[PDB]
Nucleic acid binder design. Structure first.
Ligand SMILES: [Zn+2]
Lengths: 224, 51, 59, 108, 142, 50, 86
RNA sequence: UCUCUGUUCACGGGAUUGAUUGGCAUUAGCGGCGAUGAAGGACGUGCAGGAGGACGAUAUGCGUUGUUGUUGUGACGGUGUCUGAAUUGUGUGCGGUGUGCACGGGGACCCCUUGGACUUAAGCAUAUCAGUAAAGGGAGGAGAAGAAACCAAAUGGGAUUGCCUGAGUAGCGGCGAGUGAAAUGGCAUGAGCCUGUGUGGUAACUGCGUGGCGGGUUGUGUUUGUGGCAGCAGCGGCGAGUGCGAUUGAAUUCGGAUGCGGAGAGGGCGAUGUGCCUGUAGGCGCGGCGGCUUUUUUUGUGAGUAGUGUUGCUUGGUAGUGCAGCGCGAAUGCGGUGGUGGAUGCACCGAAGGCUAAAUAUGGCUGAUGACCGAUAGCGGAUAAGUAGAGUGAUUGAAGUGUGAAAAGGAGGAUGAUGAGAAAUGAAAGUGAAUGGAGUGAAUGGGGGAUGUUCCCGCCCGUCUUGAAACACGGACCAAGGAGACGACGGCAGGAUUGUUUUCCGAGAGGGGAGGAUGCUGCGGUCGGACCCGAAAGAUGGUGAGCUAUGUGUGU
RNA sequence: CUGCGUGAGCGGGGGUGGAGGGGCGAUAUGUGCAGAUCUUGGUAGCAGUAACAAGGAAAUGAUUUGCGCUGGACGAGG
RNA sequence: UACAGCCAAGGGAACGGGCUUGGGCUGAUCAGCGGGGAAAGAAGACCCUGUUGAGCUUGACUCUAGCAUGUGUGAAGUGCUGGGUGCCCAGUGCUUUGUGGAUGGAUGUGGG
């Protein structure tokens, strides 16, 4: 729209669109402003105040986190979405809180082979590669599958688990839905510590008893 | 601006340190003669009597 | 409308005037004696003008 | 056309303006770092002042209490203190308020 | 206007810093690695290149050759080595350019004040390997 | 014309010693081949405007 | 004869090069530049939206203002000799 | 041979696929010019130089310091022709002839002045658009505001500024179209001071100077930080860990091994990457620049103002909500205010002098990000783009990216060489050469059959219209681009979570029990540029008497 | 060139090309062209047509001869 | 420049190159020519409609610059003639010691 274009009107044997003023250049006399003209503007330009986010009901947010936690103990659901497990003892998996003393990465990898999580970290490594279409040049060049999630109850992070390709961490006081059910499908493979696993009855309560650390919430009752 | 003639400012000439002094005493005389030709109130006229 | 001829002829004359010379004689209470030194024609007048010379003044 | 409520949407002025902050999560935590930085520049003294308990005005809010602006000079005097000296000890003083109730005067 | 320690991880900003940096930074990005037998005297890995150094090629059609650097072009990332050439359609020879990160340094050059550059960096590394040892051994108690 | 001001003369001189092709030693280089000046003016087609 | 034949009479030039801005727009009978307004002490208000971005801060060399900006990042220390007097 | 139609090879053109040191958006900091000569302009500077970029007679760059041996470069300091506010000037303070200050640039956001019309009302004049755009004057990193001559009607709150609720409500309005607050309640941030009546046993005071001059009694009254405390940015340097086999022009591919990790962010390298290089995580060293921080005893006042008659403008303010011209013009146990003009009780406050952080706004610059665009897109501008070019002037304004891993090499033809490959890919419209078939019928299509035809059927599409093959309009051909998406407020349908839901009638005076709430997708309604393209006009601010018209000076 | 589908469309084979490309579920849209005297670029027929030029000669042409009428200076503009 | 290009009648949006039923020159050239293609050019200027304009007029509606005429503001001191009931005002001459530059409101006029 950076011109002083005006239409020529009828009577000259050319169509009525507005046209550039001037002389001495091939731009002079060509179409301007219209959505069907070369170098024009869009019919309905894109604007910054469209709605980007959405609102979820607060209670439905917590029903979804409880389904995702419940599905991490059915072995049929954890094997449907990948997650090769043929040598774990029983689900759910719980270890003591003294894995936080592994502060070198060489030890944290030894704790994970003792739990038979060895062929799982190999499946994530071999799935890494370049993305197919145009997104690869928009700073999104590599993709790969999801692996193990460590739900602990200590402070900021475990430094010795941070470099392993295929391992995430989460705090019991956060418990977000975007890590628990990746892609919107429940059944991730989770490893609990013993301090975090004991706080699960205060966060979610029961079907007819309210929960403390979350005022009001009760599990929904059954329809069959 | 429609066939007319211009605005013509003035900024009249300036006095130079002896026309100014000559212009201050002209005003002091013209104002003193008016102060003695109108009726003077009593509270200001009493100061015309000194030791 | 547009502005009439009478009003524009008045504005043209403040821009570019016709000028005449303003004849007049001075003040001399004592009987002096003058001297006509010239009689001359002038543009825009019909009457001739005389140049008269006194002891300390011309008119 | 049709049976609808009569609409009253005011968008007839070209001078109107829209205003949106598109990232309020980073804006909140940038203001909590400002708030913790004042606190340890005043270090020993706690950055907030002690305020009184007052009563909401009309008959609709009559039965409700609230934190107010400051204490009065008589409330400070009877607690053994001068209001010029209560201000150096982190107490807020309001010389506009008037004293008209004896129970509320005692709570403060 | 140095740019090789950018915080950003954007692809357009990183390729811009490789192809358009100043000549001071073109020399550090043209760095080569030392051999095993030369890395026991000095403690460090890679060091930058200059003419007169003896190197060895690794990969390509000149894989396994050894020679002396006769010219470098830092601005274009091109190294010319005596003994890797080709015959034009006239009977004449020409030297072929090689990329600096496919070479290995053996027996470098020590004459134009370069004997001291190697000794300044050998001291900075052993002074830094003790700040790490004292911190580590005390954080051993940590 | 033969008559001209001093400021008109020094700008006509500057415009004159600009209308020139790339020197031959620069075109013979390896990385300057196929380059021509392309900012050239001919006195009949384009006018300088004083 | 108001077309082709009237063009052969146009050999007088009304303007010259302006000594403030350098365009061929200083009108000699008017004593005034139609681009920048010289000899008024202030520069003329531009006649269009695009005219503002053809001649402003940054479209020339900025010989002094660049130097001053490098000095204000270091606290305006001056010549190291004269620093004893200050 | 010519016309139409198959097939193969060669042209012509630049679509498509894949790239990208460019664009665009949101967010965090900063907001740093000038008489100590700015921004902008003109002309110059290299041994061999035109454009661009860089630079100023110390000119294609000089000094100090770091890194280097190189076409060398980083960080800081110096120089800067002739111009331009451009000033050897004009105005003005302090002095008494000395010495200061103002002027211009920019102006998104802020303060003050002035002030439209298009448009809506299906016409139009009050009204609306709108005290908005344009114009002018004055400031800063923000500005302006600010410590009750307040709000109210309780058992009362308690400076300014921003956000939610109150509420499209009370009200204003050819009571039409339209227009439109605030208090309370809930949050963010929080902070209060200076003066015009200061001694009389002696101006106790200060600008200039080194125990003096100037000011001042018509009234001056101004110590102190190389110390501490908290913070913010920058610069420099060190930085772990590798080798064989197969395919390839070359491997990061495929197959055995062997290590690092507070480092498996991203980028380059002859191709798809944890140990090939750069960095990365994390420690060390060194400048710099700010914010807080020193408290001798003091008492009392704000007039050509407030108000008011009249006239003009403004506000939701309705019989001033606020402001201004002209004229009149106050009080001292007194003055002001309480959503209808006036009276009188009760309530609540002290105007007409001065200063004040924080929470708020926003072109551009610098950092960090992205369900954004990918060369007719994205900024006009991925290149010597506000350039080439156009106009008397104010102004106006494009088109153009790709040899290869390596120059290993070509450029009239032919013969050849190098390379993995003659070298980005290379559609349609249209054409040349060869070769097969058909024709003297406008061509093309469907059924049924067949290596062209023979029988039957078949007028040119789109559109407005009672009605088109029309002597109704648009359409020579091909590629690419090209039009109901988005915001606010309400209703209904389908779906999700939860359910111990509801301030009623009436102009008032008076009277008085009767399943929703919060999101998500779609459709209908209104205002927004509003599905896309199109007037004749109206207003604000600027340019021209080189063509042509008239007057006047001086020539032919 | 060939298979499947009532259709919108989806597969396979041989050349060319020399680096990346997909299926399935939910989600975000600048989401599908024959037309607008549509926009920008390229190309036909018309058509080797209209229009324009071919100035007097002498094997040679610094020599011989035939024809036309502006010719020479100052200013503006270049 | 939709595609094309020989005629008669019929019906048809009531004057067909194409549709129905009949009549036909001539295989591909060159120069001419002005019957037809309701030939080309130009979103009919005539005429009507639109709650679309603009130039101009006045006895259209609503206003307005300027101009006229009372009246408020402005400078002090004095004499004189006249009105009504002591009173307010008119003209009014004089003196020098303000000044003449203006400015608020009211009624009439006003196709400039
Ligand atoms: Zn100028």
């Amino acid at each position: 729209m950076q011109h002083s274009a005006e239409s020529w009107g009828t009577g000259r044997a050319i169509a009525r669109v507005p046209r550039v003023k001037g002389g001495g250049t091939r731009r002079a006399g060509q179409g301007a402003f219209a959505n069907f003209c070369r170098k024009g503007r869009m019919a309905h330009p894109t604007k910054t105040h469209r709605r980007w986010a959405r609102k979820v009901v607060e209670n439905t947010k917590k029903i979804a986190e409880a389904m995702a936690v419940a599905a991490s103990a059915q072995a049929s659901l954890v094997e449907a979405r990948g997650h090769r497990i043929s040598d774990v003892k029983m689900l759910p998996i719980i270890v003591s809180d003294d894995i936080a003393k592994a502060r070198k990465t060489k030890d944290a990898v030894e704790i994970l082979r003792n739990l038979n999580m060895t062929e799982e970290l190999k499946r994530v490594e071999k799935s890494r590669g370049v993305r197919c279409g145009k997104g690869k040049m928009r700073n999104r060049r590599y993709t790969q599958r999801k692996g193990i999630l460590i739900v602990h109850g200590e402070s900021s992070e475990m430094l010795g688990f941070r470099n392993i390709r295929g391992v995430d961490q989460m705090s019991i006081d956060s418990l977000d839905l975007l890590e628990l059910a990746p892609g919107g499908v429940a059944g991730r493979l989770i490893i609990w510590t013993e301090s975090a696993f004991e706080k699960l009855d205060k966060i979610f309560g029961g079907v007819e008893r309210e929960a403390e650390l979350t005022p009001g919430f009760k599990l929904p009752n059954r329809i069959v | 601006v429609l066939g007319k003639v211009k605005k013509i400012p003035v900024e009249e000439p300036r006095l130079t340190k002896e026309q100014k002094i000559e212009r201050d005493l002209l005003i002091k005389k013209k104002v003193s003669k008016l102060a003695n030709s109108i009726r003077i109130p009593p509270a200001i006229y009493q100061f015309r009597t000194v030791l | 409308g547009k502005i009439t001829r009478r009003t524009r002829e008045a504005k043209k004359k403040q821009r570019q005037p016709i000028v005449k010379v303003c004849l007049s004689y001075p003040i001399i209470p004592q009987v002096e004696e003058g001297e006509v030194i010239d009689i001359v024609h002038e543009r825009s007048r019909g009457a001739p003008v005389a140049i008269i010379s006194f002891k300390e003044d011309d008119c | 056309k049709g049976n609808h409520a009569l609409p009253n949407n005011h968008f007839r002025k070209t001078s109107l303006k829209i205003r949106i902050h598109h990232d309020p999560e980073t804006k909140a935590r940038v203001m909590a770092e400002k708030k913790l930085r004042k606190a340890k520049a005043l270090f020993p003294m706690p950055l907030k002042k002690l305020r009184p308990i007052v009563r909401c005005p009309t008959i609709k809010y009559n039965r409700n209490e609230r934190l107010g602006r400051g204490f009065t000079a008589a409330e400070c005097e009877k607690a053994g203190l001068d209001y010029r000296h209560a201000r150096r000890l982190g107490i807020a003083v309001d010389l506009r308020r008037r004293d008209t109730n004896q129970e509320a005067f005692d709570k403060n | 206007k140095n740019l090789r320690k950018q915080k950003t991880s954007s692809r357009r900003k990183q390729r811009k810093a490789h192809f358009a940096c100043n000549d001071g930074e073109k020399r550090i990005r043209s760095s080569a690695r030392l051999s095993r037998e030369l890395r026991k005297e000095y403690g460090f890995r890679t060091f930058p290149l200059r003419t007169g150094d003896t190197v060895v090629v690794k990969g390509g059609k000149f894989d396994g050759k050894e020679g002396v650097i006769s010219k470098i072009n830092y601005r274009d990332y091109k190294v010319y080595i005596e003994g890797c050439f080709v015959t034009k359609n006239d009977g004449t020879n020409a030297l072929v350019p090689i990329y600096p990160s496919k070479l290995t340094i053996t027996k470098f050059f020590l004459e134009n004040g370069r004997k001291e550059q190697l000794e300044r960096k050998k001291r900075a590394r052993e002074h830094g390997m003790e700040i790490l040892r004292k911190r580590q051994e005390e954080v051993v108690s940590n | 014309g033969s008559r001209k001001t001093a400021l008109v003369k020094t700008r006509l001189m500057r415009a004159l010693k600009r209308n020139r092709e790339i020197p031959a030693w620069k075109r013979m280089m390896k990385e300057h081949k196929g380059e021509y000046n392309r900012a050239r003016r001919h006195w009949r087609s384009k006018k300088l405007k004083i | 004869s108001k077309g082709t034949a009237s063009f052969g009479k146009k050999n007088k030039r009304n303007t010259e090069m302006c000594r403030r801005c350098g365009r061929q727009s200083y009108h000699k009978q008017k004593n005034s530049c139609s681009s920048c307004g010289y000899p008024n002490p202030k520069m003329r208000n531009p006649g269009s939206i695009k005219a503002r971005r053809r001649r402003t801060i940054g479209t020339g060399r900025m010989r002094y203002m660049k130097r001053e900006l490098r000095a204000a990042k270091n606290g305006h220390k001056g010549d190291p000799i004269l620093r004893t007097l200050w």
